[PDB]
Design an enzyme around this catalytic site. Structure first.
Site, PDB file in Angstrom:
ATOM      1  N   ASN F 102       0.880  -1.260   0.059  1.00 24.93           N
ATOM      2  CA  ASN F 102       0.050   0.124   0.021  1.00 24.93           C
ATOM      3  C   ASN F 102       0.817   1.509   0.018  1.00 24.93           C
ATOM      4  O   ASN F 102      -0.111   2.209  -0.191  1.00 24.93           O
ATOM      5  CB  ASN F 102      -0.981   0.064   1.253  1.00 24.93           C
ATOM      6  N   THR F 152      17.288 -13.108 -31.304  1.00 18.96           N
ATOM      7  CA  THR F 152      16.042 -13.434 -31.001  1.00 18.96           C
ATOM      8  C   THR F 152      15.303 -13.792 -32.375  1.00 18.96           C
ATOM      9  O   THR F 152      15.936 -13.187 -33.146  1.00 18.96           O
ATOM     10  CB  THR F 152      15.336 -12.570 -30.576  1.00 18.96           C
ATOM     11  N   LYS F 154      12.948 -13.407 -35.470  1.00 19.93           N
ATOM     12  CA  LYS F 154      12.184 -12.384 -35.860  1.00 19.93           C
ATOM     13  C   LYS F 154      11.501 -13.077 -37.238  1.00 19.93           C
ATOM     14  O   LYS F 154      12.220 -13.981 -37.723  1.00 19.93           O
ATOM     15  CB  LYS F 154      12.937 -11.309 -36.561  1.00 19.93           C
ATOM     16  N   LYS F 156       8.578 -11.519 -34.665  1.00 14.04           N
ATOM     17  CA  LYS F 156       7.989 -12.089 -33.604  1.00 14.04           C
ATOM     18  C   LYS F 156       6.863 -12.835 -33.650  1.00 14.04           C
ATOM     19  O   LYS F 156       7.019 -14.244 -32.951  1.00 14.04           O
ATOM     20  CB  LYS F 156       7.708 -10.913 -32.654  1.00 14.04           C
ATOM     21  N   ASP F 182      10.491 -14.919 -29.037  1.00 16.26           N
ATOM     22  CA  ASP F 182       9.992 -13.531 -28.764  1.00 16.26           C
ATOM     23  C   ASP F 182       8.918 -13.482 -27.795  1.00 16.26           C
ATOM     24  O   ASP F 182       8.306 -14.594 -27.643  1.00 16.26           O
ATOM     25  CB  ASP F 182       9.412 -12.665 -29.964  1.00 16.26           C
ATOM     26  N   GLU F 183       8.923 -12.645 -26.605  1.00 16.86           N
ATOM     27  CA  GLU F 183       8.131 -12.951 -25.511  1.00 16.86           C
ATOM     28  C   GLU F 183       6.675 -13.319 -25.767  1.00 16.86           C
ATOM     29  O   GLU F 183       6.272 -14.036 -24.899  1.00 16.86           O
ATOM     30  CB  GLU F 183       8.164 -11.489 -24.880  1.00 16.86           C
ATOM     31  N   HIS F 273      12.910 -13.415 -18.573  1.00 14.69           N
ATOM     32  CA  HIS F 273      12.789 -12.198 -19.131  1.00 14.69           C
ATOM     33  C   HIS F 273      11.857 -11.135 -18.107  1.00 14.69           C
ATOM     34  O   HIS F 273      10.955 -11.471 -17.366  1.00 14.69           O
ATOM     35  CB  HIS F 273      11.802 -12.431 -20.383  1.00 14.69           C
ATOM     36  N   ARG F 274      12.270 -10.066 -18.317  1.00 12.04           N
ATOM     37  CA  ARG F 274      11.698  -8.792 -17.985  1.00 12.04           C
ATOM     38  C   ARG F 274      10.630  -7.810 -18.101  1.00 12.04           C
ATOM     39  O   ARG F 274      10.221  -6.797 -17.837  1.00 12.04           O
ATOM     40  CB  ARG F 274      13.129  -7.876 -17.593  1.00 12.04           C
ATOM     41  N   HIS F 306      17.487  -9.769 -18.306  1.00 18.54           N
ATOM     42  CA  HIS F 306      17.555  -8.677 -18.914  1.00 18.54           C
ATOM     43  C   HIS F 306      18.031  -7.317 -18.073  1.00 18.54           C
ATOM     44  O   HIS F 306      17.484  -7.315 -16.986  1.00 18.54           O
ATOM     45  CB  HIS F 306      16.217  -8.374 -19.790  1.00 18.54           C
ATOM     46  N   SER F 352      19.797  -6.370 -25.026  1.00 17.54           N
ATOM     47  CA  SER F 352      18.997  -6.569 -26.309  1.00 17.54           C
ATOM     48  C   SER F 352      18.823  -5.160 -26.957  1.00 17.54           C
ATOM     49  O   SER F 352      19.156  -4.497 -26.249  1.00 17.54           O
ATOM     50  CB  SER F 352      17.543  -7.249 -25.985  1.00 17.54           C
TER      51      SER F 352
END
Lengths: 101, 86, 426, 426, 426, 426, 101
Positions: F102, F152, F154, F156, F182-183, F273-274, F306, F352
């Protein structure tokens, strides 16, 4: 018949003096005396009902005594129990019966 | 010795705490690897301070960490990182 | 060894695992070089091409203090620090192996005894710990205001299961909080475990029914294998029993920790016994002191442990090493180290040993509120024991010194109490 | 005590267990009355109402002989015999708790030491015993006519699991037969268990590939709880690891019994170590002696057992006790009764602690082919170890007495073995 | 990029997915190209050889409308359309990574937000949506004619199990419909999760016995691991509880979607807390607005959701979004897009934060019957709070205006209620 | 508030947790009381009868330092310590819920940004941490002395499984080690997850066969539901996949931690991953700074993370913070305290976002050998990239300054690398 | 055919000068070398055959070169690798081929 309870229940019915003395005990050690009741007694029933507060600003035993007298006046047909908590130790070092219907 | 370390060791000594030091190089330091330093067996502030500065001079360019010791309890009461290689 | 394993100046870190020795070197072996060695054989054991691919210095036992033993000859006090990384997470057995496994054989030491270990708060946290602890256990049982009484059903063996539930029934219903299996009762052919368990469960049900207060029995599930333990424990959990028994000495730490993790998962309490205790801490010249064990067990997890009847000094030293959260270092009490505990729930000690009902005033003034007292036997006898407890407590709460007037209080209780009179006579 | 317990005129039966104590009574306490007390503390303890519901004499352990110790004063042996019904079937832990669970602590004895037990047949054959037996073990490794070789990685800690495999691999490839994980290495932060296992299995397989010889390592499986130990062991099985290592003193016996049974089901050799035995057995006058522990374990089940670097007579005594099917009474070697296992297989002794390969000929002549040995370190080093073994065995076989001819054999062997030439120059 | 990703004349298909962006570009950058870049970054990122192996166009995020913010400079509203193909079924997580995975790293936008999403009905139907829904809930609980009342137990930490359930009982008995944990309170050292379930169940059942109304607490089953959470929630159902608590920003969406499936399968209510929502919504410039998260969550599935004490238009907008099946677009209220839900049930709003029972009649005004009021507290206070709930609803149903007459209702109600008089006098 | 929470005299303990807030109070609110209000918010919020049943002092966040920000107005740092009981063991979730549940939602502070936390070792010891660690990951992959190359896939979306494994193979054969899903790709209808897994598996095997490098593909397992994520995880190990990918923000922390633990049990690397971070961190004046998030994850457990393409200084700060075991307080790099891990293993950093391989030498210098660089895609291109890496590391080995000589290195490398020459030409 | 190896393989076959430079950097780094050889090279196969020790009391590269040239003379049909290892770091910091058959 022979129904017991957890502490002092064996002994003869605590007269006012010994209840007071133990209140005192709680007072030196700062166990603010919590008064609760139930209409019956079965070991499975963890929880009873409070008498509208715990008596944190108790400067004397007699006040809690007089409370319990009120409680008996209104729920004399019920059982009354009193507890004290070591908030510093988070421990319930006290619970015992002071009345029976 | 800096003023703020001097005032630290003062406070430490005033309480009656003993003095210890530990040293390690930048790698050892990274791996939380400290080593014992030569005893500072003196309660006088001057002699403590002189032995601390001698120890600091001994281990130029290495991490040095100052500590507070209660001899009765045989346990640590204070951590402090006094010197660094740069 | 001295030049690398003896570090008098070494200040032992908060995160270190500190260990306190009492060793007596062989003639020709100086105390310092004995302590250095003792250090070395417990962590490293001693130019192998494998060593220089490692950080030997990082894992070394740094023996940082040696000091002669007061009022005695050929005995010195060595303190050795050990990095936290040296020991496996969750594993009492691990630390035991690393500490007390091999340095016990080092010929040059005439006589060797580890006494204390400082369990760093970090390595403390890691464990499941005890399954309910002091205060939650008291709450589950509803029991407050007085220590928990206990009685050992007899005879140790021979009794039928049906009779074993008769005996529990009487003993508990007299007013006693729990009843304990004998450690030599597990499944034996005259009494099979499942029937014991069934019958006891019946008996506690009735007893708790007719007194209306929590009853339990320390129903031992020690079985030759994890699987069997688990089976007796599961079937016990079907029965609504509040507690069981495990022999952490003769079963093992690993079995204990499994059982405790299950129990915590399962909402059933945990009792321990210390069969062979003496085998490890009796002699005055060798072993590990019972404090480190009690501390280890509390670590591994248990709600109850025996601490005997009552050296009183170090007795209450370990009582405190198993009850409080914070204790300061005290030599005289056995507490060689200071002990912070991050609020880990404490454990309930179990005094026992034919406790001689009249001895109880000092017993209570020793053990206070928070303890378990156990009787090495009939329902009136437990009635008198309960009476007496309540009275003694009562007097202690009054401010009267139990020490001095213990017989006087027991007396005061005696006149209205037939059964207490029948006992005090004996 | 001396009246009921002490039955020198009693005839022990084949159905009864015997225990051997070397006990020195407290002053004022005679030899006989102390032996009776020792019977008492372990069988029945010591009147209540449950007593007469039982047949007490059914359930009494009987001391039937006392004699003073040769060459010692006030030291005597209480030979003590017990029924069969007392114990849970197949329960090391149960038996331990029955016998030793209360006797060590009673004040009347100054230094009691549990020397030797005799398990009755009917009780003996309820176990599984060691998971395969020396004969099946030797069949599985396929190696005949010589003892085996372990090596414990060094240094103890800091090695990367990648380095730890790489040191293993050198160990095996130079001609070792086993590497052994250390009892402390269980999951340290610097090696987590699972990586280690993976790299050991890869190293074993590649050493097998290069060498053409079966290779085994002693993967530690002591794990903080039953679930870890189970998982761990499953994983090792997944890699086809023929053998594992468990610690039994800290872990206890219940868990070792579980592991032995599971391994029985899954084909997996169980190497054993005795960590913390020096606590319990080093002291001459008090403790419990390692052959009891070995006998208990061999009931529970283990393919291997360490027994010391090396009293040479008591060593071979309990060596024999762990290898052969039936042993006689031999006091010169410490063996006190005549034992039967009724076809329960043997366990390999293992030698450790600086076995000093120019002490090898004495080692063979002491034990021979039916054992394992453990060196305190390189591929050439292990090759010299290997060469010495094989020359030693050869010379033994030839009838040349090893004891005298050692250094000549080693010589001759070194003339054609440059690696053994280096090992002898050092 | 605008010639690829800016299609003003584009009509979004009802099978698309529309996301509304508030954005402030960098100086120099035109608004339209900035919004094209925002489109490109998420649907395709940007040339490679692989790109021509697919249908570029089919997988593009189409900016079909851009406008500035009225009465604001360097700010504009972007609406982007995304085909249904681009997204996984039943994965709120997928949605969040596509829409908002990396776009807030894009440099040229000084500040960015997502105001709203329109989830195509097709994409709706893949989710299970709320476990039970408002109507199914409201039937199972039995609670009708009023909004529901809650009391967050205090103090957040420190409270023992026993005391915890004591206070739950109290407050529940007073007439409150439910009780919650603080989001912080699952297994803290002072307090263990399992015992707390067990206590709470006892208290609820006692309350339900005496009061005669369905009682429940909000049982924070969030756990460090899906295994643990599963555990705690399975346990909680064993006891017969109607509801649980869990926290989505903290613990994770996936774990939610799981927990909603399981409770859907096992007939348990789910209540949600929104801790860290401030870390996504607070500022007026950058984040994702709370409405979007609430949209996502009801997709995922839940029965309750915190919605603040109560801009008042925004509050009324997204509460209606989470309440009604159809909502019409309203930029005053901030509903960017018309939305339908093909009858997927709604969710119960929650408001908490020491709601000032004097302001409670406004809260009934604002929210409407289907809602929950939580209260940041004893049995008499809980009675006074319930009776005020009554009094306000009753008055509303009389046709009296709540806002104009809040004070008259409260006081008139209090004229007959000591507890409410007392409350009001504070 | 300031009286109760602000104690400038208090010394923070190693047992206490610290939280850094860059806060600018609302007008009229002084900085000191502002810190008071913050401290009150995140632990306690701020009377009731329950309140005096506990020890407030044992549960009281303490701000011991407030200072205006250099070169900023109305900006100050509140450093607030925290006891050792407030949280649960081993749960990121509970942490974030306590710290940030909070505090962010409060009024008095116009923006609040959590900059830094400092965990007490006690808590650091209770998680599992990263499955293997950097060292162990390099051991498994057998790759040492340089950073790691990843690419990565491509575009994506749109790529067919067949296509997607083609591209994988090409990136890998050309010399990249790692491939990134890709995410947003999890299971999209054009690419079902399971057929993807198989095709990668068979492409990686065959790449590995030709190349004679261990390869790995990044396999996003993040799922709609716990069951589904687990299944896809078993099926990834079942093909011998050594590494997988998950989201800790969008999917959350309970799921990530459960996945890390399972991975630990199943020997599989776990990349992170972030995603969704920059909703939280882009604002310099409000939200949470990614050093905190990293730190929380590194408690949770994950092999990679990342950290951006690249403030340089703050980069290095939290980079060294995720790799390094112990770090000092340094404000220039944004590290506000001195931290230790107690040997919890490291996480590789990942960058990246269009890495421009003629920017490589600065990247190697700033990062070094312990990192992974991820690149926005043909086998020759991978060949050039690998070449440029190998040349860079060589040159750095030589002692040539990278900064000055990068261009000359690259050119010299290209004169014999036509792949790299072409790469330079563009 | 297209067979590469872990480290620096894509640069031209590393030659005695450049070997010397790389060895030198390894030395001033303080990581005590190890050489290693095998008949073949398998990624899935973790461990190779070290050159009878690691070098710990190392002053010059030229001795490392002599050893490599020796282990060629004995294993001219095998691959020879140089590995460097930080102890403090507990990380293998160097690992690169110096021979092919």
């Amino acid at each position: 018949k022979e129904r017991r309870f957890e502490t002092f229940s064996y002994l003869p019915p605590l007269s006012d003096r010994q209840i007071a003395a133990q209140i005192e005990y709680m007072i030196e050690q700062g166990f603010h005396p919590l008064i609760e009741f139930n209409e019956h007694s079965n070991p499975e029933e963890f929880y009873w009902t409070m008498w509208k507060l715990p008596l944190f600003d108790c400067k004397s035993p007699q006040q809690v005594l007089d409370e319990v007298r009120e409680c008996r006046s209104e729920y004399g047909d019920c059982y009354i129990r009193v507890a004290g908590f070591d908030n510093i130790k988070q421990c319930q070092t006290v619970s015992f019966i002071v009345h029976r219907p | 010795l800096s003023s703020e370390v001097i005032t630290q060791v003062r406070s430490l000594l005033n309480q009656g705490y003993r003095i210890g030091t530990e040293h390690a190089d930048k790698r050892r330091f990274r791996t939380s690897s400290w080593q014992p330093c030569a005893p500072i067996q003196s309660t006088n502030e001057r002699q403590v301070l002189s032995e601390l500065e001698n120890c600091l001079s001994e281990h130029e360019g290495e991490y040095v960490r100052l500590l507070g010791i209660d001899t009765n309890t045989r346990s640590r009461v204070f951590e402090a990182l006094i010197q660094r290689p740069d | 060894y001295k030049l690398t394993y003896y570090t008098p100046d070494y200040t032992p870190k908060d995160t270190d695992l500190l260990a306190a020795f009492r060793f007596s070197p062989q003639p020709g072996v100086p105390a310092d070089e004995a302590g250095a060695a003792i250090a070395a054989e417990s962590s490293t054991g001693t130019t192998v091409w494998t060593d220089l691919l490692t950080d030997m210095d990082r894992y070394k036992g740094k023996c940082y203090h040696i000091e002669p033993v007061q009022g005695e000859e050929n005995s010195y006090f060595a303190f050795i620090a050990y990095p936290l990384d040296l020991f496996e997470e969750g594993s009492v057995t691990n630390i035991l192996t690393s500490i007390v496994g091999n340095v016990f054989g080092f010929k040059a030491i005439r006589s060797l005894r580890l006494e204390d270990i400082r369990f760093p708060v970090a390595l403390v946290k890691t464990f499941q710990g005890p399954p309910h602890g002091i205060q939650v256990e008291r709450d589950l049982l509803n029991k407050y205001g007085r220590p928990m009484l206990g009685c050992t059903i007899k005879p140790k063996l021979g009794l039928s299961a049906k009779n074993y539930g008769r005996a529990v029934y009487e003993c508990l219903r007299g007013g006693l909080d729990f009843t304990k299996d004998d450690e030599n009762i597990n499944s034996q052919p005259f009494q099979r475990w499942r029937d014991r368990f069934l019958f006891v469960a019946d008996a506690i049900h009735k007893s708790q029914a007719e007194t209306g207060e929590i009853k339990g029995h320390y129903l031992n599930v020690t079985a030759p294998t994890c699987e069997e333990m688990m089976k007796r424990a599961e079937f016990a959990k079907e029965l609504g029993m509040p507690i069981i028994m495990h022999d952490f000495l003769t079963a093992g730490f690993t079995a204990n920790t499994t059982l405790a993790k299950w129990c915590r998962d399962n909402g059933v309490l945990l009792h321990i016994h210390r069969a062979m205790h003496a085998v490890i801490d009796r002699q005055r010249n060798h072993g590990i002191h019972f404090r480190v064990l009690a501390k280890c067990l509390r670590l591994s997890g248990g709600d109850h442990l025996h601490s005997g009847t009552v050296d009183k000094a170090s007795t209450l030293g370990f009582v405190d090493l198993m009850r409080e959260d914070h204790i300061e270092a005290d030599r005289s009490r056995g507490v060689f180290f200071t002990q912070d505990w991050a609020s880990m729930p404490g454990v309930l000690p179990v005094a026992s040993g034919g406790i001689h009902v009249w001895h109880m005033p000092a017993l209570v003034e020793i053990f206070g509120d928070d303890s378990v007292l156990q009787f090495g036997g009939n329902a009136p006898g437990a009635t008198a024991n309960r009476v007496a407890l309540e009275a003694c407590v009562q007097a202690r709460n009054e401010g009267r010194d139990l020490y001095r007037e213990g017989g006087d209080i027991l007396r005061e209780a005696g006149k209205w109490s037939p059964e207490l009179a029948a006992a005090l006579d004996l």
